[PDB]
Amino acid sequence: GLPVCGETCVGGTCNTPGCTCSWPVCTRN
């Protein structure tokens, strides 16, 4: 739930391990 992945996901997918797309920002927990 936290935007601490240093990654955006405009296209809908995140590449950082443990991160998922809270569109359009990658989040972890």
Side-chain angles (χ1 to χ4, degrees):
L2 288 159
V4 297
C5 302
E7 185 181 8
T8 57
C9 51
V10 172
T13 305
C14 300
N15 296 327
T16 303
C19 294
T20 57
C21 193
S22 294
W23 191 86
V25 177
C26 297
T27 57
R28 183 179 283 141
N29 307 314

PDB file of all heavy atoms in Angstrom:
ATOM      1  N   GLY A   1       0.789  -1.221   0.000  1.00  0.00           N
ATOM      2  CA  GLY A   1       0.000   0.000   0.000  1.00  0.00           C
ATOM      3  C   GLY A   1       0.826   1.278   0.000  1.00  0.00           C
ATOM      4  O   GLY A   1       0.274   2.381  -0.016  1.00  0.00           O
ATOM      5  N   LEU A   2       2.150   1.136   0.014  1.00  0.00           N
ATOM      6  CA  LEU A   2       3.038   2.292   0.112  1.00  0.00           C
ATOM      7  C   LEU A   2       3.812   2.506  -1.187  1.00  0.00           C
ATOM      8  O   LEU A   2       4.379   1.560  -1.733  1.00  0.00           O
ATOM      9  CB  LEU A   2       4.022   2.093   1.261  1.00  0.00           C
ATOM     10  CG  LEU A   2       3.447   2.194   2.678  1.00  0.00           C
ATOM     11  CD1 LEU A   2       4.342   1.489   3.675  1.00  0.00           C
ATOM     12  CD2 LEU A   2       3.295   3.654   3.046  1.00  0.00           C
ATOM     13  N   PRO A   3       3.863   3.755  -1.665  1.00  0.00           N
ATOM     14  CA  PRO A   3       4.538   4.077  -2.928  1.00  0.00           C
ATOM     15  C   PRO A   3       6.051   4.192  -2.734  1.00  0.00           C
ATOM     16  O   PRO A   3       6.631   5.263  -2.897  1.00  0.00           O
ATOM     17  CB  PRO A   3       3.934   5.429  -3.301  1.00  0.00           C
ATOM     18  CG  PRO A   3       3.648   6.067  -1.977  1.00  0.00           C
ATOM     19  CD  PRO A   3       3.288   4.953  -1.024  1.00  0.00           C
ATOM     20  N   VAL A   4       6.689   3.077  -2.404  1.00  0.00           N
ATOM     21  CA  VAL A   4       8.107   3.101  -2.069  1.00  0.00           C
ATOM     22  C   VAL A   4       8.908   2.207  -3.009  1.00  0.00           C
ATOM     23  O   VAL A   4       9.973   1.694  -2.646  1.00  0.00           O
ATOM     24  CB  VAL A   4       8.329   2.664  -0.602  1.00  0.00           C
ATOM     25  CG1 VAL A   4       7.644   3.645   0.345  1.00  0.00           C
ATOM     26  CG2 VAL A   4       7.792   1.249  -0.385  1.00  0.00           C
ATOM     27  N   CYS A   5       8.392   2.027  -4.221  1.00  0.00           N
ATOM     28  CA  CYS A   5       9.016   1.143  -5.190  1.00  0.00           C
ATOM     29  C   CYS A   5       9.898   1.898  -6.186  1.00  0.00           C
ATOM     30  O   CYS A   5      10.613   1.278  -6.981  1.00  0.00           O
ATOM     31  CB  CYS A   5       7.940   0.357  -5.951  1.00  0.00           C
ATOM     32  SG  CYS A   5       6.857  -0.631  -4.887  1.00  0.00           S
ATOM     33  N   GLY A   6       9.839   3.226  -6.151  1.00  0.00           N
ATOM     34  CA  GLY A   6      10.568   4.028  -7.117  1.00  0.00           C
ATOM     35  C   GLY A   6      10.186   3.628  -8.528  1.00  0.00           C
ATOM     36  O   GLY A   6      11.045   3.501  -9.404  1.00  0.00           O
ATOM     37  N   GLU A   7       8.890   3.408  -8.745  1.00  0.00           N
ATOM     38  CA  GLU A   7       8.405   2.912 -10.031  1.00  0.00           C
ATOM     39  C   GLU A   7       6.951   3.313 -10.273  1.00  0.00           C
ATOM     40  O   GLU A   7       6.110   3.175  -9.388  1.00  0.00           O
ATOM     41  CB  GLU A   7       8.505   1.380 -10.095  1.00  0.00           C
ATOM     42  CG  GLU A   7       8.127   0.809 -11.476  1.00  0.00           C
ATOM     43  CD  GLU A   7       8.196  -0.717 -11.554  1.00  0.00           C
ATOM     44  OE1 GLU A   7       8.398  -1.376 -10.507  1.00  0.00           O
ATOM     45  OE2 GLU A   7       8.045  -1.265 -12.672  1.00  0.00           O
ATOM     46  N   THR A   8       6.655   3.796 -11.475  1.00  0.00           N
ATOM     47  CA  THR A   8       5.270   4.033 -11.869  1.00  0.00           C
ATOM     48  C   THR A   8       4.824   2.906 -12.778  1.00  0.00           C
ATOM     49  O   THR A   8       5.660   2.174 -13.306  1.00  0.00           O
ATOM     50  CB  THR A   8       5.091   5.385 -12.581  1.00  0.00           C
ATOM     51  OG1 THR A   8       5.955   5.454 -13.731  1.00  0.00           O
ATOM     52  CG2 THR A   8       5.421   6.518 -11.625  1.00  0.00           C
ATOM     53  N   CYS A   9       3.515   2.749 -12.954  1.00  0.00           N
ATOM     54  CA  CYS A   9       2.995   1.681 -13.799  1.00  0.00           C
ATOM     55  C   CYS A   9       1.835   2.185 -14.647  1.00  0.00           C
ATOM     56  O   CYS A   9       0.717   1.671 -14.562  1.00  0.00           O
ATOM     57  CB  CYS A   9       2.562   0.474 -12.953  1.00  0.00           C
ATOM     58  SG  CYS A   9       1.462   0.901 -11.565  1.00  0.00           S
ATOM     59  N   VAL A  10       2.112   3.192 -15.473  1.00  0.00           N
ATOM     60  CA  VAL A  10       1.099   3.751 -16.360  1.00  0.00           C
ATOM     61  C   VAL A  10       0.481   2.645 -17.221  1.00  0.00           C
ATOM     62  O   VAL A  10      -0.736   2.593 -17.382  1.00  0.00           O
ATOM     63  CB  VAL A  10       1.671   4.908 -17.229  1.00  0.00           C
ATOM     64  CG1 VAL A  10       0.660   5.353 -18.289  1.00  0.00           C
ATOM     65  CG2 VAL A  10       2.083   6.091 -16.340  1.00  0.00           C
ATOM     66  N   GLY A  11       1.324   1.740 -17.722  1.00  0.00           N
ATOM     67  CA  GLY A  11       0.872   0.609 -18.515  1.00  0.00           C
ATOM     68  C   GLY A  11       0.174  -0.500 -17.744  1.00  0.00           C
ATOM     69  O   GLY A  11      -0.342  -1.435 -18.347  1.00  0.00           O
ATOM     70  N   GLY A  12       0.170  -0.416 -16.416  1.00  0.00           N
ATOM     71  CA  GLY A  12      -0.589  -1.353 -15.599  1.00  0.00           C
ATOM     72  C   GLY A  12       0.201  -2.457 -14.913  1.00  0.00           C
ATOM     73  O   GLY A  12      -0.373  -3.230 -14.147  1.00  0.00           O
ATOM     74  N   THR A  13       1.504  -2.541 -15.179  1.00  0.00           N
ATOM     75  CA  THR A  13       2.346  -3.587 -14.606  1.00  0.00           C
ATOM     76  C   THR A  13       3.592  -2.991 -13.944  1.00  0.00           C
ATOM     77  O   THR A  13       4.166  -2.025 -14.452  1.00  0.00           O
ATOM     78  CB  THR A  13       2.777  -4.614 -15.686  1.00  0.00           C
ATOM     79  OG1 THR A  13       1.618  -5.152 -16.339  1.00  0.00           O
ATOM     80  CG2 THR A  13       3.575  -5.755 -15.072  1.00  0.00           C
ATOM     81  N   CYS A  14       4.007  -3.572 -12.821  1.00  0.00           N
ATOM     82  CA  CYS A  14       5.248  -3.166 -12.151  1.00  0.00           C
ATOM     83  C   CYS A  14       6.273  -4.267 -12.311  1.00  0.00           C
ATOM     84  O   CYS A  14       5.920  -5.449 -12.334  1.00  0.00           O
ATOM     85  CB  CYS A  14       5.012  -2.915 -10.656  1.00  0.00           C
ATOM     86  SG  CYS A  14       3.811  -1.616 -10.329  1.00  0.00           S
ATOM     87  N   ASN A  15       7.544  -3.883 -12.373  1.00  0.00           N
ATOM     88  CA  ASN A  15       8.612  -4.857 -12.546  1.00  0.00           C
ATOM     89  C   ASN A  15       9.438  -5.068 -11.281  1.00  0.00           C
ATOM     90  O   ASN A  15      10.191  -6.033 -11.180  1.00  0.00           O
ATOM     91  CB  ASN A  15       9.511  -4.459 -13.720  1.00  0.00           C
ATOM     92  CG  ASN A  15       8.768  -4.464 -15.042  1.00  0.00           C
ATOM     93  OD1 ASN A  15       7.855  -5.266 -15.247  1.00  0.00           O
ATOM     94  ND2 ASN A  15       9.149  -3.563 -15.947  1.00  0.00           N
ATOM     95  N   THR A  16       9.274  -4.185 -10.301  1.00  0.00           N
ATOM     96  CA  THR A  16      10.025  -4.302  -9.056  1.00  0.00           C
ATOM     97  C   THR A  16       9.499  -5.462  -8.204  1.00  0.00           C
ATOM     98  O   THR A  16       8.295  -5.547  -7.946  1.00  0.00           O
ATOM     99  CB  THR A  16       9.984  -2.988  -8.242  1.00  0.00           C
ATOM    100  OG1 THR A  16      10.499  -1.908  -9.035  1.00  0.00           O
ATOM    101  CG2 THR A  16      10.819  -3.109  -6.967  1.00  0.00           C
ATOM    102  N   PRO A  17      10.398  -6.361  -7.770  1.00  0.00           N
ATOM    103  CA  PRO A  17       9.982  -7.470  -6.901  1.00  0.00           C
ATOM    104  C   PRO A  17       9.209  -6.990  -5.676  1.00  0.00           C
ATOM    105  O   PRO A  17       9.644  -6.066  -4.973  1.00  0.00           O
ATOM    106  CB  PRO A  17      11.314  -8.114  -6.494  1.00  0.00           C
ATOM    107  CG  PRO A  17      12.220  -7.831  -7.650  1.00  0.00           C
ATOM    108  CD  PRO A  17      11.828  -6.442  -8.123  1.00  0.00           C
ATOM    109  N   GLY A  18       8.044  -7.595  -5.452  1.00  0.00           N
ATOM    110  CA  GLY A  18       7.238  -7.296  -4.282  1.00  0.00           C
ATOM    111  C   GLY A  18       6.302  -6.121  -4.485  1.00  0.00           C
ATOM    112  O   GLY A  18       5.506  -5.789  -3.608  1.00  0.00           O
ATOM    113  N   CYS A  19       6.386  -5.487  -5.649  1.00  0.00           N
ATOM    114  CA  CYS A  19       5.530  -4.345  -5.921  1.00  0.00           C
ATOM    115  C   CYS A  19       4.423  -4.712  -6.890  1.00  0.00           C
ATOM    116  O   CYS A  19       4.601  -5.562  -7.759  1.00  0.00           O
ATOM    117  CB  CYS A  19       6.346  -3.182  -6.481  1.00  0.00           C
ATOM    118  SG  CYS A  19       7.511  -2.508  -5.277  1.00  0.00           S
ATOM    119  N   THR A  20       3.275  -4.067  -6.732  1.00  0.00           N
ATOM    120  CA  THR A  20       2.138  -4.281  -7.633  1.00  0.00           C
ATOM    121  C   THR A  20       1.546  -2.947  -8.031  1.00  0.00           C
ATOM    122  O   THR A  20       1.808  -1.931  -7.381  1.00  0.00           O
ATOM    123  CB  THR A  20       1.014  -5.097  -6.977  1.00  0.00           C
ATOM    124  OG1 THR A  20       0.573  -4.433  -5.784  1.00  0.00           O
ATOM    125  CG2 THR A  20       1.491  -6.504  -6.646  1.00  0.00           C
ATOM    126  N   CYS A  21       0.725  -2.944  -9.082  1.00  0.00           N
ATOM    127  CA  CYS A  21       0.221  -1.682  -9.625  1.00  0.00           C
ATOM    128  C   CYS A  21      -1.046  -1.123  -8.981  1.00  0.00           C
ATOM    129  O   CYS A  21      -2.148  -1.607  -9.233  1.00  0.00           O
ATOM    130  CB  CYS A  21       0.004  -1.787 -11.139  1.00  0.00           C
ATOM    131  SG  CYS A  21      -0.250  -0.165 -11.925  1.00  0.00           S
ATOM    132  N   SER A  22      -0.872  -0.102  -8.147  1.00  0.00           N
ATOM    133  CA  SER A  22      -1.990   0.692  -7.654  1.00  0.00           C
ATOM    134  C   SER A  22      -2.117   1.839  -8.643  1.00  0.00           C
ATOM    135  O   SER A  22      -1.624   2.935  -8.387  1.00  0.00           O
ATOM    136  CB  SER A  22      -1.698   1.240  -6.250  1.00  0.00           C
ATOM    137  OG  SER A  22      -1.608   0.198  -5.291  1.00  0.00           O
ATOM    138  N   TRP A  23      -2.764   1.568  -9.779  1.00  0.00           N
ATOM    139  CA  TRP A  23      -2.671   2.444 -10.954  1.00  0.00           C
ATOM    140  C   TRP A  23      -2.779   3.933 -10.645  1.00  0.00           C
ATOM    141  O   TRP A  23      -3.742   4.361 -10.027  1.00  0.00           O
ATOM    142  CB  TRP A  23      -3.669   2.043 -12.051  1.00  0.00           C
ATOM    143  CG  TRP A  23      -3.386   2.772 -13.338  1.00  0.00           C
ATOM    144  CD1 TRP A  23      -2.506   2.394 -14.322  1.00  0.00           C
ATOM    145  CD2 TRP A  23      -3.934   4.029 -13.752  1.00  0.00           C
ATOM    146  NE1 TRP A  23      -2.489   3.336 -15.327  1.00  0.00           N
ATOM    147  CE2 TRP A  23      -3.359   4.346 -15.004  1.00  0.00           C
ATOM    148  CE3 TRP A  23      -4.862   4.915 -13.190  1.00  0.00           C
ATOM    149  CZ2 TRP A  23      -3.681   5.510 -15.702  1.00  0.00           C
ATOM    150  CZ3 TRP A  23      -5.181   6.078 -13.888  1.00  0.00           C
ATOM    151  CH2 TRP A  23      -4.592   6.363 -15.131  1.00  0.00           C
ATOM    152  N   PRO A  24      -1.787   4.730 -11.083  1.00  0.00           N
ATOM    153  CA  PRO A  24      -0.628   4.359 -11.912  1.00  0.00           C
ATOM    154  C   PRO A  24       0.703   4.323 -11.150  1.00  0.00           C
ATOM    155  O   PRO A  24       1.757   4.590 -11.746  1.00  0.00           O
ATOM    156  CB  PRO A  24      -0.576   5.511 -12.914  1.00  0.00           C
ATOM    157  CG  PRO A  24      -0.929   6.705 -12.054  1.00  0.00           C
ATOM    158  CD  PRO A  24      -1.950   6.193 -11.021  1.00  0.00           C
ATOM    159  N   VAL A  25       0.663   4.000  -9.862  1.00  0.00           N
ATOM    160  CA  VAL A  25       1.874   4.010  -9.034  1.00  0.00           C
ATOM    161  C   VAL A  25       2.132   2.620  -8.460  1.00  0.00           C
ATOM    162  O   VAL A  25       1.213   1.973  -7.971  1.00  0.00           O
ATOM    163  CB  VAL A  25       1.734   5.025  -7.875  1.00  0.00           C
ATOM    164  CG1 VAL A  25       2.973   5.001  -6.962  1.00  0.00           C
ATOM    165  CG2 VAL A  25       1.481   6.427  -8.424  1.00  0.00           C
ATOM    166  N   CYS A  26       3.374   2.150  -8.534  1.00  0.00           N
ATOM    167  CA  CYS A  26       3.715   0.869  -7.938  1.00  0.00           C
ATOM    168  C   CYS A  26       3.774   0.993  -6.427  1.00  0.00           C
ATOM    169  O   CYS A  26       4.358   1.937  -5.893  1.00  0.00           O
ATOM    170  CB  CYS A  26       5.045   0.345  -8.466  1.00  0.00           C
ATOM    171  SG  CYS A  26       4.992   0.037 -10.237  1.00  0.00           S
ATOM    172  N   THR A  27       3.167   0.032  -5.743  1.00  0.00           N
ATOM    173  CA  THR A  27       3.140   0.056  -4.286  1.00  0.00           C
ATOM    174  C   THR A  27       3.607  -1.270  -3.705  1.00  0.00           C
ATOM    175  O   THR A  27       3.563  -2.314  -4.365  1.00  0.00           O
ATOM    176  CB  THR A  27       1.733   0.399  -3.729  1.00  0.00           C
ATOM    177  OG1 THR A  27       0.771  -0.546  -4.224  1.00  0.00           O
ATOM    178  CG2 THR A  27       1.314   1.808  -4.141  1.00  0.00           C
ATOM    179  N   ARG A  28       4.072  -1.206  -2.461  1.00  0.00           N
ATOM    180  CA  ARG A  28       4.439  -2.396  -1.705  1.00  0.00           C
ATOM    181  C   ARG A  28       3.670  -2.296  -0.390  1.00  0.00           C
ATOM    182  O   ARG A  28       3.840  -1.332   0.357  1.00  0.00           O
ATOM    183  CB  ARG A  28       5.957  -2.430  -1.462  1.00  0.00           C
ATOM    184  CG  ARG A  28       6.466  -3.682  -0.741  1.00  0.00           C
ATOM    185  CD  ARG A  28       7.989  -3.651  -0.549  1.00  0.00           C
ATOM    186  NE  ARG A  28       8.706  -3.981  -1.783  1.00  0.00           N
ATOM    187  CZ  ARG A  28       9.824  -3.384  -2.189  1.00  0.00           C
ATOM    188  NH1 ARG A  28      10.373  -2.413  -1.471  1.00  0.00           N
ATOM    189  NH2 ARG A  28      10.398  -3.758  -3.318  1.00  0.00           N
ATOM    190  N   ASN A  29       2.794  -3.264  -0.135  1.00  0.00           N
ATOM    191  CA  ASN A  29       1.920  -3.224   1.043  1.00  0.00           C
ATOM    192  C   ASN A  29       1.119  -1.927   1.136  1.00  0.00           C
ATOM    193  O   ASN A  29       1.042  -1.311   2.200  1.00  0.00           O
ATOM    194  CB  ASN A  29       2.716  -3.448   2.336  1.00  0.00           C
ATOM    195  CG  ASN A  29       3.560  -4.701   2.292  1.00  0.00           C
ATOM    196  OD1 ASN A  29       3.093  -5.767   1.882  1.00  0.00           O
ATOM    197  ND2 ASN A  29       4.819  -4.580   2.698  1.00  0.00           N
TER     198      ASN A  29
END
